[PDB]
Write a protein that binds this ligand. Structure first.
Ligand code: MG
Ligand code: MG
Lengths: 157, 49, 48, 149, 158, 48
């Protein structure tokens, strides 16, 4: 047999159907596995040139556990305890009465970087630099939540 | 021959059951929608009243 | 505290980016055909 | 007798009036079904049918489909057939101004002055069937409607 | 009549066979077009808890050997007859009582069901009472009843 | 009475004649979601 199984649990019902569409569109030959020939030549269709062998490296992570069903198991395994952005939006809006993305940069600095969780300033600079900065130098926690959930963009090829 | 004749048996029986049942229940719906239309008639009647 | 427990937790995954490793073009596959209907539903809801 | 089509109609009415046992037939049930199956005269036929004015037991008034058939014939020999000329003249005598301005009260009065009366919900039900306004009909429309069954 | 369903469930809409082929594809982890002990004992275990009773051999013994896609489709095809989608039942329930509020009183329900029409026993009618959720004070709602009769709603979940 | 007793008998005999196979109908809701969403989008567009 294929010999792959795990304890099943639902994480996002409104996402699995898109996950199954993604699995179908990559799996042109309808194999259920992950193949370098199947994906790399297909990635180069819309992509520029993903010829570097990090793909074979990542398909070499574990010996033959790949299947459509376990594609949910790995993602749920990585990430657990996730809340929708809108309730997270309310949580962000809790401290600031404006609740219009005008969270001040120094407000966020003074609060998060030092008081409460004592950590370095670097672990916030990546949000400072990678993510866009709101007008006047604010924290547009609306589009910030959007990029936390789905709006994060990078090189699309 | 017996295979094809019982094929027409099944086909025609299923189609007649579906068609006649839909027709009779659609006349039931005919009466029902006529009744709702006449309730709207009395609604306009009480507005006029 | 309930803000801190999950924000950096996801942003810690952003430092892990396992999803990126095989779906650097994940937004591209997200905007194939489904984005049209999510946008249509969102616009209809907000206009209503 | 006619062909087996009328026997089939009586059989399907028999299975239609199958409450409290298909086999047994109540004289009330048979009277209702025979009336509705195109025989108006039902008032005084209880004595002409039973031969016994006994009308005390509602639960068991014995009748069977076998002897039911000749009963239908001896009723359907049409012992009485009236026509609307007598009816309209009686109503126009009952009428007051020749047009029927407000006939609602007096028709109820004349039907409650008769000794052999049975129902009041039908009396309030007669408003249906073009008898809607305050006795607007000069009785021709209602006679035409009733003489259509 | 014969009730053999010579055609492959031709007397029905074809949408349900796309849902059935999706179900077949998701149960067939081997994806060879045939069910298997390997297939079900893990796909049923995906939501189940590895049942000890050997009723998947019940399926493979109901239709001997591994079953074809068409075999699965026809063994469901013999399971559908004399039934119609929710629209007609809803319309009928709207017809019988004018109010359409679904206040089918228990006495009224039993009178309208057990007594007239095709004679059948109220004792077997009681399966509609001991299992189906009846509303209180005698009246019996139908919209939830229609949904549970169809695939729209289920009383419980595994 | 004819139609509804026929339907009721057919469902009640098959309420547990093939109970298990009627209980694997769980993924039907998951797989019908695309068609249901497209349709509901259509009717909400006409209701707008
Ligand atoms: Mg593949
Ligand atoms: Mg297989």
């Amino acid at each position: 047999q294929r010999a792959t199984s795990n304890v099943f649990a639902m994480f996002d019902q409104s996402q699995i159907q898109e996950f199954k569409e993604a699995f179908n569109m990559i799996d042109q030959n309808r194999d259920g596995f992950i193949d370098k020939e199947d994906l790399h030549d297909m990635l180069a269709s819309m992509g520029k040139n993903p010829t570097d062998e990090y793909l074979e490296g990542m398909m070499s992570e574990a010996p033959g556990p790949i299947n459509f069903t376990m594609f949910l198991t790995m993602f749920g395994e990585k990430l657990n305890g996730t809340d929708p952005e809108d309730v997270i939006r309310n949580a962000f809006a809790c401290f600031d009465e404006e609740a219009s993305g005008f969270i001040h940069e120094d407000h966020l600095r003074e609060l998060l970087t030092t008081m409460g969780d004592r950590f370095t300033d670097e672990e916030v600079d990546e949000m400072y630099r990678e993510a866009p900065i709101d007008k006047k130098g604010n924290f547009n926690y609306v589009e910030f939540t959007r990029i936390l959930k789905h709006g994060a963009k990078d090189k699309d090829d | 021959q017996v295979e094809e004749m019982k094929t027409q048996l099944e086909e025609l029986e299923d189609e007649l059951q579906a068609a006649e049942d839909a027709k009779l229940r659609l006349e039931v719906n005919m009466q029902a929608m006529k009744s709702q239309f006449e309730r709207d008639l009395q609604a306009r009647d009480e507005q006029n009243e | 505290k309930v803000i801190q427990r999950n924000c950096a937790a996801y942003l810690k995954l952003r430092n892990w980016q396992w999803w990126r490793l095989f779906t650097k073009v994940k937004p591209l596959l997200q905007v194939t055909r489904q984005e049209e209907e999510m946008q249509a539903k969102d616009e209809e809801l907000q206009r209503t | 007798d006619f062909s087996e089509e009328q026997t089939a109609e009586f059989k399907e009415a028999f299975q239609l009036f199958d409450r409290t046992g298909d086999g047994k037939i109540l004289y009330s049930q048979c009277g209702d079904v025979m009336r509705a199956l195109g025989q108006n005269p039902t008032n005084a036929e209880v004595m002409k049918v039973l031969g016994n004015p006994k009308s005390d037991e509602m639960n068991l008034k014995t009748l069977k489909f076998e002897q039911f058939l000749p009963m239908m014939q001896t009723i359907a020999k049409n012992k009485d057939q009236g026509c609307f000329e007598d009816y309209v003249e009686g109503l126009r005598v009952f009428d007051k101004e020749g047009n029927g301005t407000v006939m609602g009260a007096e028709i109820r009065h004349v039907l409650v002055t008769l000794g052999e009366k049975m129902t009041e919900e039908e009396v309030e039900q007669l408003v249906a069937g073009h008898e809607d306004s305050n006795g607007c009909i000069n009785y021709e429309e209602l006679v035409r409607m009733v003489l259509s069954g």
